Amino acid sequence: SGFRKMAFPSGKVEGCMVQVTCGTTTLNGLWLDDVVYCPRHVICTSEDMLNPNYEDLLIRKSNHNFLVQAGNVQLRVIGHSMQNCVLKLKVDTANPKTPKYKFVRIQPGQTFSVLACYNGSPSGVYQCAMRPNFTIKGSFLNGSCGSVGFNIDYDCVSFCYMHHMELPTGVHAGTDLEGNFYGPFVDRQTAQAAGTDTTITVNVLAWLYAAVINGDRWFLNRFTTTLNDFNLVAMKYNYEPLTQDHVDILGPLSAQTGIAVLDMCASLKELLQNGMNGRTILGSALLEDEFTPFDVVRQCSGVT
Amino acid sequence: SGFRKMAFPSGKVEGCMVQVTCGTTTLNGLWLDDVVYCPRHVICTSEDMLNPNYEDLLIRKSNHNFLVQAGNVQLRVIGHSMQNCVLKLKVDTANPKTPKYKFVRIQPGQTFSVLACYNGSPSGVYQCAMRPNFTIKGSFLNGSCGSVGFNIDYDCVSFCYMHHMELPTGVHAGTDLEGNFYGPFVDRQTAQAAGTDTTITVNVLAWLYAAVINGDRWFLNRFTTTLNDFNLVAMKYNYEPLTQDHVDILGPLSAQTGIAVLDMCASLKELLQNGMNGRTILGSALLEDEFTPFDVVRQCSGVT
Ligand SMILES: CC(=O)Nc1ccc(Oc2ncccn2)cc1
Ligand SMILES: CC(=O)Nc1ccc(Oc2ncccn2)cc1
């Protein structure tokens, strides 16, 4: 029993982290097979960042201007290309620790672990969600760029995120491992205002299930609701609309607990309208939205 | 910027996790050098657990009754002893992945990462504190016993916890790696009521510092207080007494932010007396007490 914000074990990703230096910029790269992936803004000064022309900056760089260090051993760069907002550095050595891996582009509301790194050295791991405005609320200092977000399915690491930017509001923007930004963000130091940070309704319901399963039941009420009725209250509270797909996804938690999804919706409706009245749910004073239904089932069943 | 509940990278501990089976009980062991550490209740049936005589149960066991599996390779057990509440199984092979390590007994209020495991396979990592009543609020299902808590200093893993028990109230009890329980708890399935779960005041102040450093400043007030005055309010709110040692420990955060410790105490005093009024601090609706001053300095400076 007990329910924790749990990251995936980080070991398989720790074995992929390298330091990339281009002139006076150092940040992190991901070494998979004989390729190192890193933010293309490694080639930028902080002055470059105000209005970089990446293609033009890049022409001045040779393979030997990219210094790749894995632990305290330098890798030899034998090729470099730009793919969208990532650089791919071909090195002469396949990472001996390459795990089985996929590159996946996640949808907003999906959760992932981040291995926060500096000079290619891991400092910590934490669990995130891709917010509905395609930001993440990370912990990222200068030198953390190239830190990656991932899920693990048994032995297969699915890489979903690479850290590129802190927006002036202190939230985080980044790309998939094809170098495409999540949302409308760009690797330029300019005004970039995120949209509404809505609450991931389906994740909140999952976490209310997780709570019931762990003995926190005070918020269970006598009411039900309908998707359309619930969704009027969701709109009012900057909660994502709930779809029949979300209902279906919560089906197994519904089954395990014997609480119909729409009953738990009515419970959430009362929490939104009445607040917590100084009470907590799984040790939180607010409604947690960074557990997916899959996360709740994994953690509550004990998947390794 | 941003501030996250961050675990240590788990890789060095993942390389130490094995499965220990004694008859029909399977749980996790820690393989360091040629020794595997595990809860001594591996030798118990769930019936044994109601009133186990460990010495008497243990006499019936031979080296070959202990099945140690590292990945899908069996280790050969050449010795077993009981030390307090842990079994030490001598195996004929030194773990090739043994990191530099220490066994340390932490004090209440100190934080650590847990690698939650099942059948010797890691499922996740999360950050904890030893509560002032010597419990932890973990996430631990059946088969999770032998899962360990640790800090890392650069390359040296300090092991501080091994998971033994879920108390009837759903909180967690365990030992150091010498097999001594934190607090008054015992490896027996019986009424064991934890004391008052007080809030780790020094950790809350550290986290208010972390917040100020990350731009959450709304709770900064015009008041100061004294240790004795603050401590009257702490008592009332089941907060640990603040000592001059805690003040000293917060000194560097004080220096970095230019907010005297007693001013931040007066800020906390107002939060305790007035509550949050529906506001948040680093995305929490309650005062977080599972960051140490060391944790705040590490995460805010970027230590790897
Ligand atoms: C686009 C730019 O500004 N400079 C650049 C041009 C061609 C390049 O050649 C290349 N090499 C290996 C694989 C793929 N591509 C690399 C970098
Ligand atoms: C205490 C008990 O009930 N049974 C037991 C007795 C002596 C033991 O010998 C031993 N062997 C190696 C190192 C240290 N000790 C082991 C287990």
XYZ file of C-alpha atoms and ligand atoms in Angstrom:
642
model
C 0.000 0.000 0.000
C 0.902 3.720 -0.258
C 1.018 5.699 -3.518
C 4.106 7.672 -4.661
C 5.108 9.925 -7.579
C 7.460 7.236 -8.947
C 9.995 7.600 -11.807
C 11.230 4.629 -13.830
C 14.583 3.198 -12.728
C 17.081 5.491 -14.540
C 20.005 3.015 -15.010
C 19.366 2.203 -18.700
C 19.311 5.992 -19.536
C 22.302 6.824 -17.248
C 24.343 4.539 -19.591
C 23.432 6.773 -22.597
C 24.339 10.228 -21.191
C 27.377 12.077 -22.598
C 28.747 15.633 -22.441
C 28.671 17.616 -25.721
C 30.759 20.810 -25.969
C 30.750 23.156 -28.993
C 33.113 26.081 -28.172
C 31.971 27.592 -24.853
C 28.524 25.859 -24.717
C 28.431 22.519 -22.777
C 25.228 20.457 -22.480
C 24.093 16.804 -22.430
C 23.741 14.362 -25.333
C 22.072 10.959 -25.667
C 24.418 8.183 -27.038
C 22.376 5.365 -28.696
C 24.288 3.049 -31.076
C 26.899 5.206 -32.909
C 24.788 8.452 -32.794
C 24.781 11.201 -30.097
C 21.588 13.306 -29.969
C 21.715 16.842 -28.519
C 19.946 20.233 -28.749
C 21.179 22.021 -31.925
C 21.530 25.217 -29.774
C 24.836 23.651 -28.525
C 26.348 25.687 -31.449
C 24.923 28.990 -30.021
C 26.432 31.671 -27.749
C 23.738 33.221 -25.434
C 23.859 36.186 -27.937
C 23.133 33.754 -30.847
C 20.024 32.615 -28.890
C 18.209 36.020 -29.320
C 17.858 35.324 -33.105
C 19.874 32.235 -34.248
C 20.176 31.225 -37.940
C 20.996 27.559 -37.229
C 21.903 26.591 -40.839
C 24.327 29.585 -41.028
C 25.824 28.930 -37.535
C 26.166 25.236 -38.437
C 28.211 25.756 -41.705
C 31.102 27.150 -39.535
C 31.214 23.852 -37.511
C 33.232 20.693 -38.407
C 32.992 17.186 -36.819
C 36.116 18.133 -34.703
C 34.349 21.255 -33.239
C 31.968 18.819 -31.444
C 33.656 17.434 -28.283
C 31.804 14.316 -27.023
C 32.938 12.882 -23.676
C 31.449 9.649 -22.219
C 32.628 9.484 -18.631
C 36.242 10.716 -19.011
C 36.791 9.083 -22.491
C 36.419 11.274 -25.641
C 34.420 9.830 -28.596
C 35.580 10.574 -32.173
C 32.896 12.458 -34.231
C 32.851 11.194 -37.899
C 29.648 12.988 -38.981
C 27.068 15.608 -37.908
C 23.626 16.539 -39.304
C 20.779 18.766 -38.134
C 17.382 17.026 -37.858
C 14.721 19.682 -37.006
C 15.992 21.084 -33.630
C 18.436 18.209 -32.781
C 22.006 17.526 -33.871
C 22.942 13.930 -34.602
C 26.696 13.379 -34.109
C 27.916 10.121 -35.730
C 30.712 8.728 -33.484
C 33.107 5.830 -34.430
C 31.979 3.731 -31.377
C 28.543 2.153 -30.728
C 27.499 2.812 -27.083
C 28.133 -0.640 -25.481
C 25.293 0.181 -23.027
C 22.634 1.043 -25.701
C 19.364 -0.466 -24.332
C 16.531 -1.557 -26.606
C 14.884 1.805 -27.419
C 12.172 3.637 -29.400
C 11.668 7.331 -30.196
C 7.990 8.193 -29.494
C 6.117 11.506 -29.593
C 3.745 11.528 -26.565
C 0.358 13.319 -26.400
C -0.426 16.002 -23.799
C -1.424 14.381 -20.453
C 1.104 11.528 -20.874
C 3.683 11.138 -18.077
C 7.414 10.319 -18.318
C 10.563 10.216 -16.138
C 13.310 12.889 -16.608
C 16.968 12.116 -15.826
C 18.261 15.645 -15.050
C 21.978 15.809 -16.118
C 24.874 18.366 -16.084
C 28.113 17.829 -18.118
C 26.709 14.395 -19.165
C 26.438 13.328 -15.435
C 23.033 12.445 -13.925
C 21.997 14.490 -10.822
C 18.452 13.151 -10.314
C 15.258 11.561 -11.660
C 11.632 12.803 -11.351
C 8.256 12.042 -13.001
C 6.540 14.670 -15.304
C 3.514 15.079 -17.555
C 3.390 16.770 -20.968
C 0.945 19.617 -19.956
C -2.048 20.342 -22.255
C -0.174 23.576 -23.352
C 2.864 21.357 -24.382
C 5.071 22.648 -21.539
C 6.520 20.568 -18.690
C 7.071 21.798 -15.118
C 10.639 20.508 -14.771
C 13.634 21.192 -12.564
C 16.328 22.351 -15.043
C 19.368 24.639 -14.337
C 21.897 26.023 -16.929
C 23.723 23.012 -18.500
C 20.662 20.683 -18.148
C 19.724 20.931 -21.899
C 19.911 17.480 -23.606
C 18.504 15.831 -20.420
C 15.823 13.392 -21.774
C 12.365 12.139 -20.786
C 11.499 8.453 -21.154
C 9.160 5.590 -20.378
C 10.353 1.952 -19.922
C 8.219 -1.064 -21.084
C 10.074 -4.054 -19.384
C 13.519 -3.633 -21.117
C 12.617 -1.130 -23.940
C 13.292 2.594 -23.227
C 10.871 4.834 -25.244
C 12.553 8.293 -25.397
C 9.851 11.010 -25.644
C 11.567 14.309 -24.673
C 14.851 16.241 -24.839
C 15.131 19.477 -22.784
C 15.779 22.645 -24.888
C 14.293 25.840 -23.321
C 13.177 27.569 -20.114
C 10.369 30.002 -21.119
C 10.501 33.424 -19.357
C 7.652 32.116 -17.033
C 10.046 29.371 -15.731
C 8.234 26.423 -17.419
C 10.082 24.094 -19.804
C 9.882 23.403 -23.565
C 11.630 20.642 -25.527
C 11.454 18.256 -28.479
C 10.887 14.574 -29.206
C 14.068 12.669 -30.303
C 13.269 13.632 -33.964
C 13.940 17.217 -32.803
C 10.305 18.415 -33.231
C 9.203 20.740 -30.380
C 6.145 19.789 -28.346
C 3.681 22.612 -29.025
C 4.470 25.908 -30.806
C 7.824 26.565 -29.047
C 11.138 27.359 -30.843
C 14.865 27.302 -29.780
C 15.024 31.139 -29.728
C 15.387 33.432 -26.629
C 12.204 35.453 -27.262
C 8.690 36.086 -25.833
C 6.957 32.672 -25.944
C 3.777 32.641 -23.854
C 2.305 29.189 -23.059
C -1.517 28.847 -23.287
C -3.878 27.846 -20.442
C -2.323 25.120 -18.230
C -5.484 22.981 -17.945
C -5.726 20.073 -15.453
C -5.515 16.581 -17.035
C -9.001 15.399 -15.951
C -8.461 11.656 -16.846
C -5.227 11.652 -14.717
C -7.088 13.229 -11.733
C -9.821 10.509 -11.929
C -7.070 7.810 -12.173
C -5.464 9.254 -8.986
C -8.892 9.317 -7.182
C -9.148 5.600 -8.075
C -5.556 5.109 -6.698
C -6.650 6.860 -3.478
C -9.793 4.710 -3.024
C -7.574 1.591 -3.599
C -5.224 2.883 -0.795
C -8.019 3.622 1.746
C -8.507 7.421 1.218
C -12.321 7.326 0.626
C -13.688 10.452 2.436
C -14.455 12.243 -0.916
C -16.706 9.404 -2.235
C -20.225 10.956 -2.463
C -23.799 9.726 -3.164
C -24.023 11.438 -6.619
C -23.445 10.544 -10.250
C -23.269 12.835 -13.303
C -23.130 12.570 -17.147
C -20.128 13.386 -19.407
C -21.955 16.546 -20.673
C -22.862 17.708 -17.106
C -19.382 16.943 -15.684
C -17.803 18.721 -18.736
C -19.704 22.004 -17.962
C -17.989 21.918 -14.479
C -14.616 20.923 -16.120
C -14.810 23.944 -18.525
C -15.541 26.274 -15.548
C -12.462 24.888 -13.628
C -9.934 24.797 -16.603
C -10.101 20.984 -16.635
C -9.674 19.113 -19.969
C -12.942 17.777 -21.446
C -13.603 14.115 -20.505
C -14.256 11.868 -23.574
C -15.725 8.350 -23.835
C -12.112 7.291 -24.681
C -11.040 8.512 -21.184
C -14.056 6.616 -19.646
C -12.967 3.450 -21.497
C -9.317 3.918 -20.376
C -10.515 4.117 -16.702
C -12.673 0.943 -17.186
C -10.229 -1.452 -15.414
C -9.888 0.899 -12.338
C -13.724 1.157 -12.377
C -13.929 -2.686 -12.406
C -11.279 -3.206 -9.674
C -12.895 -0.608 -7.328
C -16.568 -1.118 -8.376
C -16.987 2.704 -8.634
C -18.563 3.620 -12.036
C -16.441 6.284 -13.847
C -19.387 8.813 -13.815
C -19.826 8.367 -10.016
C -16.109 9.214 -9.586
C -16.716 12.158 -11.996
C -19.534 13.366 -9.632
C -17.075 12.957 -6.707
C -14.522 15.136 -8.584
C -17.341 17.656 -9.411
C -18.040 18.081 -5.642
C -14.260 18.444 -4.915
C -14.049 21.183 -7.610
C -17.185 23.006 -6.300
C -16.538 22.546 -2.528
C -12.690 22.239 -2.401
C -10.868 19.945 0.107
C -12.034 21.797 3.303
C -8.439 21.371 4.711
C -8.388 17.565 4.061
C -5.835 15.656 1.919
C -5.962 12.816 -0.678
C -2.864 10.580 -0.773
C -1.053 13.322 1.233
C -1.864 16.092 -1.355
C -3.957 19.253 -0.648
C -4.688 19.560 -4.395
C -5.976 17.178 -7.104
C -2.891 15.433 -8.657
C -2.972 15.174 -12.498
C 0.563 13.669 -13.177
C -0.572 9.991 -12.795
C -2.017 8.347 -15.976
C -4.516 5.493 -15.643
C -1.611 3.240 -16.886
C 0.643 4.689 -14.106
C -2.026 3.919 -11.440
C -2.483 0.293 -12.730
C 1.334 -0.248 -13.009
C 2.084 1.130 -9.478
C -1.033 -0.496 -7.848
C -0.231 -3.977 -9.471
C 3.627 -3.745 -9.104
C 4.844 -4.029 -12.771
C 8.713 -4.370 -13.140
C 14.560 26.926 -12.586
C 11.666 24.774 -11.278
C 11.841 22.566 -8.172
C 11.007 18.820 -8.216
C 10.813 15.930 -5.724
C 13.931 14.314 -7.238
C 15.355 10.833 -6.465
C 19.011 9.955 -7.019
C 19.768 8.151 -10.287
C 19.007 4.491 -9.390
C 21.482 2.718 -11.765
C 24.170 1.917 -9.154
C 21.488 0.282 -6.876
C 19.689 -1.488 -9.792
C 22.997 -3.413 -10.269
C 22.764 -4.747 -6.659
C 19.165 -6.083 -6.647
C 18.577 -9.860 -6.531
C 15.613 -12.162 -5.848
C 15.786 -14.221 -2.618
C 13.387 -17.170 -2.207
C 13.120 -19.298 0.962
C 10.364 -21.916 0.348
C 7.206 -20.041 -0.705
C 8.381 -16.520 0.357
C 10.069 -14.436 -2.424
C 11.441 -10.933 -1.756
C 14.384 -8.702 -2.759
C 18.004 -8.831 -1.578
C 20.922 -6.413 -1.902
C 24.114 -7.996 -3.449
C 27.263 -6.049 -2.374
C 30.610 -7.872 -2.765
C 29.980 -11.588 -1.977
C 27.108 -10.913 0.534
C 23.329 -10.681 -0.168
C 21.338 -8.706 2.436
C 17.606 -9.404 2.886
C 14.824 -9.213 5.514
C 15.171 -12.245 7.857
C 11.343 -12.705 7.537
C 12.128 -14.359 4.134
C 12.145 -17.598 6.252
C 8.535 -16.937 7.478
C 5.129 -18.126 6.205
C 2.412 -15.416 6.741
C 1.348 -17.639 9.741
C 4.943 -17.466 11.139
C 4.632 -13.635 10.984
C 1.947 -13.499 13.785
C 4.609 -14.621 16.353
C 7.916 -15.722 14.691
C 10.821 -17.237 16.692
C 13.513 -16.334 14.131
C 16.371 -18.329 15.758
C 14.123 -21.462 15.854
C 12.807 -20.950 12.266
C 16.392 -20.346 11.098
C 17.887 -23.652 12.501
C 15.681 -25.586 9.970
C 17.299 -23.649 7.034
C 20.527 -24.620 5.165
C 22.542 -22.510 2.642
C 20.750 -24.505 -0.175
C 17.251 -23.482 1.136
C 18.146 -19.876 0.124
C 17.631 -19.414 -3.656
C 19.418 -16.245 -4.881
C 18.810 -15.225 -8.505
C 20.602 -12.231 -10.123
C 18.810 -11.584 -13.387
C 18.194 -15.176 -14.587
C 21.512 -16.586 -13.145
C 21.424 -18.415 -9.753
C 24.156 -17.547 -7.183
C 25.588 -20.331 -4.972
C 25.022 -19.658 -1.202
C 28.106 -20.786 0.865
C 27.045 -19.224 4.193
C 24.135 -17.523 6.014
C 23.952 -15.601 9.320
C 21.300 -13.499 11.048
C 22.406 -9.956 11.978
C 19.584 -8.297 14.015
C 16.615 -8.362 11.535
C 18.661 -9.022 8.319
C 20.027 -12.223 6.808
C 23.468 -12.072 5.234
C 23.854 -14.780 2.558
C 27.524 -15.371 1.603
C 27.584 -16.225 -2.148
C 30.644 -17.621 -4.076
C 30.628 -14.622 -6.527
C 31.391 -10.939 -5.767
C 28.763 -8.708 -7.477
C 30.771 -7.336 -10.472
C 28.573 -4.192 -10.270
C 29.199 -3.453 -6.525
C 29.514 0.382 -6.338
C 31.528 2.117 -3.632
C 29.101 1.962 -0.672
C 28.534 2.710 3.037
C 25.885 1.499 5.495
C 24.580 4.558 7.418
C 21.785 4.920 9.977
C 19.955 8.204 9.163
C 18.194 10.465 11.710
C 14.480 11.322 11.480
C 13.912 14.175 8.959
C 16.651 12.883 6.605
C 15.561 12.102 3.024
C 16.576 9.185 0.763
C 15.621 7.561 -2.573
C 13.814 4.149 -2.598
C 14.218 1.724 -5.521
C 10.929 -0.234 -5.245
C 11.588 -3.842 -6.483
C 9.604 -7.117 -6.997
C 11.355 -10.508 -7.594
C 14.710 -8.609 -7.574
C 13.510 -6.384 -10.529
C 13.218 -2.591 -10.091
C 9.741 -1.085 -10.816
C 10.378 2.544 -9.791
C 12.272 5.157 -7.761
C 10.874 7.869 -5.422
C 12.239 10.213 -2.712
C 11.244 9.719 1.019
C 11.991 11.104 4.471
C 12.477 9.128 7.693
C 9.420 10.611 9.580
C 9.934 11.838 13.186
C 7.961 8.681 14.335
C 10.539 6.479 12.405
C 8.008 5.444 9.733
C 8.231 6.208 6.004
C 5.255 6.887 3.709
C 6.326 4.525 0.918
C 4.695 2.768 -2.008
C 5.256 -0.954 -1.244
C 3.131 -3.961 -2.432
C 3.559 -7.673 -1.399
C 7.029 -8.830 -2.618
C 8.600 -5.329 -2.185
C 10.427 -6.276 1.097
C 14.250 -5.980 0.692
C 13.772 -2.848 -1.500
C 16.402 -0.369 -0.120
C 16.705 3.366 0.554
C 19.921 5.203 -0.316
C 21.739 8.476 -0.817
C 24.569 8.948 -3.394
C 27.601 11.257 -2.705
C 29.238 11.499 -6.245
C 30.039 7.736 -6.749
C 29.480 6.382 -3.157
C 26.032 4.842 -2.408
C 25.162 5.191 1.343
C 22.468 2.528 2.029
C 20.204 3.720 4.893
C 17.020 1.576 4.695
C 15.688 -1.891 3.834
C 11.877 -2.347 3.639
C 10.452 -4.905 6.153
C 6.850 -4.095 7.266
C 3.573 -2.367 6.374
C 1.960 -1.320 9.709
C -1.850 -1.847 9.885
C -2.210 1.987 9.252
C -0.527 1.523 5.801
C 2.759 3.311 6.713
C 6.116 1.542 6.355
C 8.768 0.303 8.824
C 12.244 -1.047 8.033
C 15.854 -1.363 9.176
C 19.282 0.066 8.395
C 21.645 -2.391 6.571
C 22.835 -3.663 10.025
C 19.253 -4.956 10.398
C 18.299 -2.543 13.245
C 14.726 -1.188 12.857
C 14.221 2.568 12.701
C 12.121 3.336 15.785
C 10.419 0.759 18.047
C 9.078 -1.483 15.227
C 9.596 -5.293 15.003
C 9.256 -7.901 12.156
C 6.052 -9.341 13.709
C 2.448 -9.083 12.318
C 0.949 -7.420 15.417
C -0.561 -4.099 16.635
C 2.241 -1.525 16.184
C 0.932 2.038 16.458
C 3.276 4.805 15.204
C 3.479 7.995 17.340
C 2.601 11.545 16.201
C 3.718 12.168 12.581
C 5.164 15.657 13.200
C 6.179 17.957 10.301
C 9.967 18.302 9.775
C 10.156 22.078 10.429
C 13.788 22.537 9.126
C 12.784 20.786 5.821
C 9.717 23.088 5.434
C 11.935 26.213 5.901
C 14.459 24.760 3.366
C 11.578 24.320 0.851
C 10.338 27.932 1.506
C 13.903 29.043 0.655
C 13.741 26.835 -2.528
C 10.440 28.543 -3.432
C 11.802 32.095 -2.949
C 14.829 31.085 -5.138
C 12.327 29.912 -7.862
C 10.150 33.086 -7.782
C 7.265 31.942 -5.477
C 7.466 34.881 -2.982
C 3.793 35.722 -2.136
C 4.127 34.272 1.444
C 7.093 36.548 2.387
C 5.742 38.830 5.181
C 6.958 41.916 7.125
C 7.444 39.996 10.441
C 10.235 38.239 12.297
C 10.039 35.964 15.361
C 12.402 34.260 17.887
C 13.143 30.498 18.174
C 11.125 30.364 21.466
C 8.131 32.273 19.955
C 8.164 30.272 16.682
C 8.470 27.011 18.740
C 5.212 27.788 20.685
C 3.442 27.918 17.231
C 5.363 24.746 16.082
C 4.181 22.808 19.212
C 0.554 23.908 18.531
C 0.805 22.673 14.858
C 2.670 19.306 15.517
C 5.842 20.754 13.965
C 9.270 19.591 15.268
C 11.022 22.121 17.544
C 13.502 24.351 15.644
C 17.036 24.330 17.196
C 20.020 26.655 16.659
C 21.564 23.655 14.786
C 18.667 23.871 12.251
C 19.222 27.704 12.010
C 22.937 27.090 11.330
C 22.123 24.388 8.714
C 19.852 26.920 6.868
C 22.638 29.600 7.022
C 23.773 29.178 3.364
C 20.133 29.424 2.026
C 19.732 32.500 4.298
C 22.926 33.991 2.752
C 21.983 33.168 -0.880
C 18.437 34.632 -0.505
C 19.243 37.398 2.053
C 16.192 36.307 4.139
C 17.237 35.810 7.821
C 16.147 32.333 9.089
C 13.871 33.915 11.807
C 12.108 36.094 9.169
C 11.367 32.904 7.170
C 10.230 31.333 10.500
C 7.762 34.285 10.922
C 6.609 33.666 7.308
C 5.983 29.971 8.170
C 4.198 31.074 11.423
C 1.714 33.155 9.331
C 1.214 30.210 6.876
C 0.450 27.907 9.862
C -1.960 30.450 11.475
C -3.639 31.721 8.246
C -3.247 28.690 5.885
C -2.637 29.071 2.095
C -6.013 30.793 1.292
C -6.247 28.573 -1.887
C -2.725 29.567 -3.119
C 0.187 27.175 -3.857
C 3.980 27.131 -3.191
C 6.055 25.294 -5.823
C 2.764 23.717 -7.048
C 1.860 22.297 -3.557
C -1.269 23.247 -1.512
C 0.518 22.109 1.679
C 3.930 22.819 3.269
C 6.407 20.185 1.890
C 8.752 18.663 4.539
C 10.569 15.955 2.397
C 13.347 18.340 1.149
C 16.400 18.718 3.483
C 18.448 21.928 3.388
C 21.165 19.755 1.669
C 18.541 18.598 -0.916
C 17.554 22.245 -1.656
C 21.254 23.318 -2.075
C 22.065 20.217 -4.235
C 19.001 20.661 -6.546
C 19.275 24.523 -6.679
C 23.109 24.357 -7.498
C 22.922 21.236 -9.800
C 25.261 18.720 -8.006
C 25.958 15.467 -10.044
C 22.620 22.181 -42.712
C 23.881 22.994 -42.401
O 23.807 24.155 -42.177
N 25.182 22.365 -42.337
C 25.366 20.961 -42.634
C 25.195 20.607 -43.959
C 25.383 19.303 -44.360
C 25.723 18.332 -43.435
O 25.931 17.058 -43.969
C 25.421 15.851 -43.473
N 26.311 14.956 -43.066
C 25.955 13.768 -42.623
C 24.599 13.445 -42.623
C 23.696 14.400 -43.094
N 24.125 15.578 -43.512
C 25.933 18.685 -42.107
C 25.747 20.005 -41.696
C 21.109 -18.214 14.756
C 20.330 -19.406 14.191
O 19.238 -19.649 14.581
N 20.887 -20.238 13.148
C 22.227 -20.034 12.642
C 23.248 -20.348 13.520
C 24.562 -20.228 13.128
C 24.872 -19.769 11.860
O 26.237 -19.733 11.566
C 26.936 -18.674 10.970
N 27.501 -18.924 9.797
C 28.221 -18.023 9.162
C 28.416 -16.786 9.774
C 27.836 -16.574 11.026
N 27.114 -17.521 11.598
C 23.853 -19.484 10.959
C 22.520 -19.608 11.349
